[PDB]
């Protein structure tokens, strides 16, 4: 009843392959504050959905998405509800804006009872991925009540700078990804560690170059960094924040295991039908989608699917469906949400192009076949980053998808949000 997590025994969904269009996307970007004007880019988006609530974030800057002057950073929370016509909508209820919008980077949100806790990086040198050596590690926490109050002190909004971070042997750590999970009173955020390339142990014999003629054995190791001679390598994982502790907040870094290892990239961890799932973006030579059931969270190990149908666009070195080790840092973030564990079928958006960020398709797929899909825009639509999150409305599976697009109507690079019901039958 109402809007709930994807748990229990949902209504049935079509598990057969069909080339008919049976998915019917909707625009729901309206009850949100993305109010358009040209000259601006709206970048660094974030979407999270948990227990009938949501977190959202973006950075609006004037001019270039890269070099433009930052104007406003939004971190908002609200409810996911039925308008009355059995279609889920998003209603912002509590919005936080920092005083300096150029300093917040790489936010990540996880929900726990009364709040969304969103963990961000504070930087005075731009993106720490690009200014890794210049970035002094500074992490902040913005905690937002999903249902604010009137005379509640700092119950509504609470900003707090983290001083105690256990990073192990990594020089610094950072949130990297849109959303994470709770386990009891312990929160886990998708994150990344910066390791000096000098103390990175990696047997080059592990690099899988069998029947990969033009691939050398070093390529794996060299691809663990933003480029072949980067000072750091990036190792994905989790940042753990245990709410039961009390005292000065401690975050603790948990590196991801080295099976199907690829360069640290924006990832996300979420619960589906009882159990945690991990998606890691393929920013490297391993361009087939990286997702799977979490075996253990701490230490973090992931049973990656052997998916042979979903990939991501790249560039001339590591384009779509590339599978041989190369030295590259290319690709996009396009996550997927487990909606049926028995058949392991997932829902998500991919970019139907080999070397260009365009043509976003919402697809329901299994490991070796796409069951069904629908384009979300036109053939040539510039689109890059997609965040898909599914849930239940009156026990029917719905997915909300954030897609970062070029909007032609206002000539603005911006996020748009789509709601897709997953149909019961395979035939109209």
């Amino acid at each position, epitope marked *: 009843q109402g809007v709930s997590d994807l748990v229990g025994l949902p209504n049935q969904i079509c598990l057969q392959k069909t080339t008919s269009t049976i998915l019917k996307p909707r625009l729901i970007s309206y009850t949100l504050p993305i109010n358009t004007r040209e*000259g601006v*880019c709206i970048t660094d988006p974030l979407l999270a959905v948990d227990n009938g609530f949501f977190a959202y974030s973006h950075l609006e800057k004037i*001019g*270039s*998405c*890269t*070099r*433009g002057i930052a104007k406003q950073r939004i971190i908002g929370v609200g409810e996911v509800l039925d308008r009355g016509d059995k279609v889920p909508s998003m209603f912002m209820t509590n919005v936080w804006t920092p005083p300096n919008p150029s300093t917040i980077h790489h936010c990540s949100s996880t929900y726990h009872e009364d709040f969304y806790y969103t963990l961000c990086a504070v930087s005075h040198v731009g*993106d720490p*991925i*690009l200014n890794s050596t210049s970035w002094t590690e500074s992490l902040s926490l913005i905690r937002l009540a999903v249902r604010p109050k009137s005379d509640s002190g700092d119950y509504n909004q609470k900003y707090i700078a983290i001083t105690k971070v256990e990073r192990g042997k990594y020089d610094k750590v950072m949130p990297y990804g849109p959303s994470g999970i709770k386990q009891g009173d312990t929160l886990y955020f998708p994150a990344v560690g910066f390791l000096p390339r000098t103390e990175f142990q990696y047997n080059d014999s592990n690099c899988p170059i069998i029947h990969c003629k033009y691939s050398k054995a070093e390529n794996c190791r060299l691809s663990m960094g933003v480029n072949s001679k980067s000072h750091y390598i990036l190792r994905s994982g989790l940042l753990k924040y245990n709410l039961s502790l009390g005292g000065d907040i401690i975050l603790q870094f948990i590196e991801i295991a080295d099976n199907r290892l690829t360069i640290g*990239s924006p990832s996300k961890i979420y619960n589906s039908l009882g159990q945690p799932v991990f998606y890691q973006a393929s*920013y490297s030579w391993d361009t087939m989608i990286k997702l799977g059931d979490v075996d253990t969270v701490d230490p973090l190990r992931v049973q990656w699917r052997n998916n042979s149908v979903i990939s*991501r*666009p*790249g*560039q001339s070195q590591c384009p779509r469906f590339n599978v041989c080790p190369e030295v590259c*840092w*290319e*690709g*996009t973030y396009n996550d997927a949400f487990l909606i049926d564990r028995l058949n392991w079928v997932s829902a998500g958006v991919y*970019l139907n*192009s080999n*070397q*260009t*960020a365009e043509n976003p398709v919402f697809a329901v797929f299994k490991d070796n076949e796409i069951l069904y899909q629908v384009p979300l825009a036109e053939d*040539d639509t*510039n*689109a*890059q980053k997609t965040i898909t999150d599914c849930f239940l409305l009156e026990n029917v599976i719905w997915c909300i998808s954030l897609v*970062e*697009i*070029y909007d032609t109507g206002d*000539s603005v*690079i911006r996020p748009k949000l789509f709601a897709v019901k997953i149909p019961a039958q395979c035939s109209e």
Partner: antibody
Amino acid sequence: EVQLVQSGAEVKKRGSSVKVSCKSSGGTFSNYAINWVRQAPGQGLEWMGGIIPILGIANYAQKFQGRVTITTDESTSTAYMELSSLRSEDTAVYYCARGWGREQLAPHPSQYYYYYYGMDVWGQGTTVTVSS
Amino acid sequence: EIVMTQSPGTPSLSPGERATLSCRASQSIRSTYLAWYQQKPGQAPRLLIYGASSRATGIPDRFSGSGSGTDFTLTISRLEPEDFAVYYCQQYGRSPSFGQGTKVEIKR
């Protein structure tokens, strides 16, 4: 109505450098792109590069990467193209032209792509001779 | 990086007549990213076509664009004294490139 005005014809030594001006008469550079095209005497046109001032981005063809700096001055509504280490092969006429330019999303974690469109407003051209 | 080849190089044909000049890319390209320019004797070029079929601000209706994929075509309906000039095709976008040019001579 707007048209562009370029600097005067120049003669320069082999190894020297040139900085050709191109100023907007009617209005600012507001959101358009300024491309730089060159024509060797008796030959065809080759795109050297372009700039989009409202974004603060310049892009160049590979053949001229490193040798060419396309700069602006929005106080003076004026773009500049500087070529360096002039070889006899750079004796040519250099036009500045104006068309639309758009920033686009790229399949890269940080990079953006920049698209230079058809050029509809042309400067008169600036002849550059290089000879010892 | 994309290479444009034009043809013919030096066509000779008579005034008042129709003309068709071909441009071909070493790559398949979207039609949106193609232009036709005209350079009259000893002066600046001017834009005829963009998006492979559209005449610009202030252009006579003689000029017509065609083609897609890898093959493109400019068409002059009624040739006229000023219509004898050099014609360049341009693929534009990330790294624009011109063809070597087609110069329409006078037939006599």
